[PDB]
Amino acid sequence: VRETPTDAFGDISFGGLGQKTGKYVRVSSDTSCENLYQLMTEQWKLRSPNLLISVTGGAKNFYIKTHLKDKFRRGLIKVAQTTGAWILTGGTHAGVMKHVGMAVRDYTLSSGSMEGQIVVIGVAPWGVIHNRSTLIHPEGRFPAYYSLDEQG
Amino acid sequence: QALLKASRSDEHAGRHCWERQLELAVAWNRVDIAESEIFTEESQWTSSDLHPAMFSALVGDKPEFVRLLLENGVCVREFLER
């Protein structure tokens, strides 16, 4: 497999609530580690990491008896919010990351997002996004609009 | 809720069950029951398929239901395309 200078760069904004503006970048199977940490730290203005927490598993779906889930969502945001943590997950609306997304969404209205945003970093392969053509460009599309679709 | 539970199994087979089901939630001013049942975590949506409920909710001047539909996935830019 051969290599080429990358593309698909810009900030994904969702049509629902005009309070988010998530940045999107691509990368290869192997990328300079110092460049990766520099892009994560100095580039996107994200502050220094204090605690790295890793939610993993599942990827399909599961059901919680609806008593433990509230404590889980509340606590997993209490810790991240106050310790300037970084939480990482496989970022795709399928199962476990959907529960993390409902956590971030159910808290993000209550706090008001004054300062110290809940930095949630996500990892997802660039081929397997269904609506891929909505942002692909070599010079990018910086205020890009994107709608949800999961029937494909 | 028993009215809706009766309402699902009827003559129509299809997308229409969910489609018909909402409009009943629109015509009633009540939002909580409708919201919970129709907006469960498992269910998927699309910003095209909420347009008639949005339109009926605007014309009938019910505010909180409009806010609920706007928080859950209706984009204003898709809605006034024509």
Describe it.
- The structure is cut from a larger assembly and holds 2 copies of chain A.
- By secondary structure, chain A is an alpha/beta fold.
- Chain A is built from 3 helices and 6 strands, in the order E-E-H-E-H-E-H-E-E.
- Chain A has helices at 33-43, 68-82, 96-111; strands at 10-14, 22-24, 52-54, 86-90, 120-123, 143-146.
- In chain A, strands 2-1-6 form a 3-stranded mixed beta sheet, with no helix packed on it. In chain A, strands 3-4-5 form a 3-stranded parallel beta sheet, with no helix packed on it.
- The two termini of chain A are 28 Å apart.
- Chain A binds chain B through residues 15-17, 61, 98, 102, 145, 147-151, and chain B through 41-42, 44-47, 70-78.
Short description:
It is classed as transport protein. The structure is cut from a larger assembly and holds two copies of chain A. The first copy, chain A, is α/β, with parallel strands linked by helices.
Number of helices of chain A: 3
The best one-word shape of chain A is: globular
Number of strands of chain A: 6
Which range best describes the helical content of chain A: under 10%, 10-25%, 25-40%, 40-55%, 55-70% or over 70%?
A: 25-40%
Radius of gyration of chain A: 17 Å
Series of secondary-structure elements of chain A, N-terminal to C-terminal:
EEHEHEHEE
End-to-end Cα distance of chain A, whole Å, is 28 Å
Give the strand line-up of the largest sheet of chain A. Answer: 2-1-6
Major sheet of chain A: size, sense and barrel closure?
Answer: 3 strands, mixed
Biggest interface, chains and residues, is: A-B, 12 and 15 residues
Structural class of chain A: alpha/beta
- Quaternary structure of the protein: part of a larger assembly
PDB class: transport protein
Keywords: transport protein
Entry title: Structure of TRPM2 ion channel receptor by single particle electron cryo-microscopy, Apo state
Chains A, B: Transient receptor potential cation channel, subfamily M, member 2
